[PDB]
Design a protein around this ligand. Structure first.
Ligand code: HEM
Ligand code: HEM
Ligand SMILES: CNCCN(c1cc(F)cc(CCc2cc(C)cc(N)n2)c1)C1CC1
Ligand SMILES: CNCCN(c1cc(F)cc(CCc2cc(C)cc(N)n2)c1)C1CC1
Ligand SMILES: C[C@H](O)[C@H](O)[C@H]1CNc2nc(N)[nH]c(=O)c2N1
Ligand SMILES: C[C@H](O)[C@H](O)[C@H]1CNc2nc(N)[nH]c(=O)c2N1
Ligand SMILES: [Cl-]
Ligand SMILES: [Cl-]
Lengths: 362, 362
């Protein structure tokens, strides 16, 4: 059954990929080559062109992503050659450096060897390559609560966090054949962070907020033509609301709205004053301003939605069906001010794509 | 087939209704009475208790409505006795007066005779009993564009609007056996309106905005136990975002955000300044403040979501499944600041309920 699944997914992907690449005449010989290889080995190996276009197709098919206009300019780094933990570490360090690009962020993906028989070659524990630790003990909350379980797991492995609100988690990953993951501290010279200030309100710096420059999702599986790349971290640049309306605002994240209300000089006493809404707007203005001031790439939700409209137009003009998840595409502030809110989207799953996978901790 | 549908819907409704009313022992005799009546007449007539509880169940089952905590206090007016257009008009006038209640709004529904064989007895053309006209001619937009088609239809019937931005449409409805609907001008003494001012910004009155006090949906069908009440206007009170984030803000409605930005003294030049978001917040604060200042009922979206949380808790505690439409329940500003955004809802249709029906104009 498993080989049949592979072959069926392979046929569909190669035909579509080669069609898009104007290589339709080569489909038949490639398909034969693949079928023999599956028969003889139980799997097949993508060409570099297939891997690159496959990762791009996967982004294009990601229903929850508003940033898809730029799918075809993804920078794909082929690291299927890695065999050691030092090579994985250096490849992750390199991804951070080249994606960051001194603040002019390059959307990038680094692709490690795929699963063989469901057996992972490299298993990354981090949710993002750069993220803050979280602690909870005796009523005391420190840092990012979303990171509490991973932080606890790291501290089982001999790591110890300083317990500031912004401790950088180490990289943590496991190699096939090892019982435990290894961890490596991130070189601070690689990690750009942005202090949050406000364009008009000088007191906003009293909150001492900051966030990291580049969000690099490292716990999703890339699936391309039946091949499962469980380790394939990728990044774009932030849309401001991710930081200002969620990471810093959610009650189960940094929960800063009451403190924001106080520094911008408004009462946080009555629902009818809409103080949470006003605080959200000012915090989100501050996030956009601060990233821009430091020369780190970011996009606001209005510009992002306009770009997504162009993605919709491009899909239709190219004759491709559009898929999307309305509930994730609408931004968490002023959604009705974007065109997304006022139309609907087919939430069907098309492959290649990025998928959730079970955590190895928890 | 049609009688069978009726009987099946009747069985399900009476059992559930009588169960809720602690009248379970009476279900069998009532069901027999109904079955004979369907056989002999092709239909059946609800008791006043059934009609009242049915309309309440229908509200409770309305997936898109955040205001459902108060379903059991709906004021149900039984007007199945009306036979003339003067009686319908006076009943609609009365609904406005008693629902308005000098500003302390009473959630109310007036129920007219139901369809007989799909044949309507009374056909209401208005979308809401109180709404503003809209005009579009030679590049000139006046009033509410959502009302353009109904306004044009009214002006076919001898009505003429003054062409202010806030012309009250007349009541317009058709009686069984008449080819054309009739129209009646609304007595202004019945219609409460609220001028929009801002708590801190004196210039906000320069926009000369206003809105009407009571939203009274008059074009939906109430279905109860297989009986189709196509004419059954109902109202609650406004949630502020309906007015400030949509009616006055949508580009295809009153489109006031640029003017709002100007009176609150901010530039409307750069997406990254989040001027639309800031304008939305101030306009929404102004709407809440103005309704409160005038003593007209209104609820903010935070309080409304908290009430909806209690509705969820009440449903579970009563052993009823909860249904809801996430895409309509989330408010259009700061949705991620409400609990609704962070959970999911089963969007299944349960009856009794309120349904869309085809417009008689357009
Ligand atoms: C270029 C800049 C990009 C922007 C501004 C952007 C924007 C976003 C945003 C706002 C989300 C919602 C995430 C959340 O709320 O947690 C998202 C989800 C997503 N994006 Fe993008 N994105 C970008 C690039 C990329 C790239 C390069 C990839 C992959 C190659 C990608 C794949 C995804 C996926 C898979 C999700 C949803 C995953 C999930 O279900 O949690 N995006 N994107
Ligand atoms: C008591 C105050 C009430 C509040 C604050 C409230 C709130 C809301 C809101 C905000 C919406 C979204 C509508 C839109 O965006 O256009 C809505 C939809 C709805 N409400 Fe309520 N509501 C209330 C009372 C009622 C009552 C009394 C009924 C019926 C007896 C009702 C039935 C509905 C229905 C059927 C819809 C959706 C109709 C559609 O699909 O367009 N509501 N409600
Ligand atoms: C938190 N719930 C979703 C979890 N999650 C996530 C995935 C993304 F692709 C993207 C994000 C948001 C971060 C992000 C990622 C990228 C690539 C760009 C961008 N602007 N923002 C989260 C990974 C699956 C576990
Ligand atoms: C505009 N698109 C939906 C159209 N629509 C509508 C229905 C409602 F029940 C409610 C509303 C919103 C007005 C409303 C109605 C009530 C009863 C309370 C409240 N706070 N607000 C609209 C009627 C079906 C045509
Ligand atoms: C396509 C989308 O479902 C549509 O624009 C909805 C979104 N959610 C909404 N929610 C409410 N409350 N009212 C609306 O009119 C809409 N419009
Ligand atoms: C239940 C609901 O779908 C869930 O809270 C979603 C809503 N939409 C979202 N949208 C984005 N972009 N990110 C999220 O984390 C969520 N959470
Ligand atoms: Cl993030
Ligand atoms: Cl309305």
């Amino acid at each position: 059954e498993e080989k049949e699944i592979l072959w069926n997914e392979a046929k569909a992907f190669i035909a579509a990929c080669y069609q898009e690449l104007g290589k339709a005449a080569e489909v038949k010989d490639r398909l034969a080559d693949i079928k023999s290889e599956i028969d003889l080995t139980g799997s097949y190996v993508h060409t570099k062109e297939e891997l690159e276009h496959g990762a791009k197709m996967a982004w294009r098919n990601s229903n929850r992503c508003i940033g898809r206009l730029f799918w075809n300019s993804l920078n794909v780094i082929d690291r299927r050659d890695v065999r050691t933990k030092e090579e994985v570490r250096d490849a992750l360090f390199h991804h951070i450096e080249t994606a960051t690009n001194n603040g002019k962020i390059r959307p990038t993906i680094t692709i490690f060897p795929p699963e063989e028989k469901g057996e992972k070659q490299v298993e990354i524990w981090n949710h993002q390559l750069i993220r803050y630790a979280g602690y909870e003990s005796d009523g005391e909350r420190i840092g990012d609560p979303a990171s509490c379980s991973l932080t606890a797991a790291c501290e089982e492995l001999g790591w110890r966090g300083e317990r500031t609100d912004f401790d950088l988690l180490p990289l943590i990953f496991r190699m096939k054949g090892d019982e435990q993951p290894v961890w490596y501290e991130l070189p601070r010279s690689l990690v750009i962070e942005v202090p949050i200030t406000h364009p008009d309100i000088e007191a906003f710096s009293d909150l001492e907020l900051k966030w990291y420059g580049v969000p690099i999702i490292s716990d999703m599986k890339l699936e391309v033509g039946g091949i499962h790349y469980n380790a394939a971290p990728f990044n774009g640049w932030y849309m401001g609301t991710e930081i200002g309306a969620r990471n810093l605002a959610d009650e189960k994240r940094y929960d800063k709205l009451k403190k924001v209300a106080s520094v911008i000089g408004i009462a946080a006493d009555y629902n009818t004053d809409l103080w949470k809404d006003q605080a959200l707007v000012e915090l989100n203005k501050a996030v956009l301003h601060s990233y821009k001031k430091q020369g780190v790439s970011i996009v606001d939700h209005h510009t992002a939605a306009s770009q997504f409209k162009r993605f919709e137009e491009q899909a239709e003009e190219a004759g491709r069906k559009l898929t999307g998840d309305w509930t994730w595409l609408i931004p968490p502030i002023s959604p009705a001010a974007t065109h997304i809110f006022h139309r609907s989207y087919d939430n069907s799953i098309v492959k290649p794509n990025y998928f959730y996978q079970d955590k190895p901790y928890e």
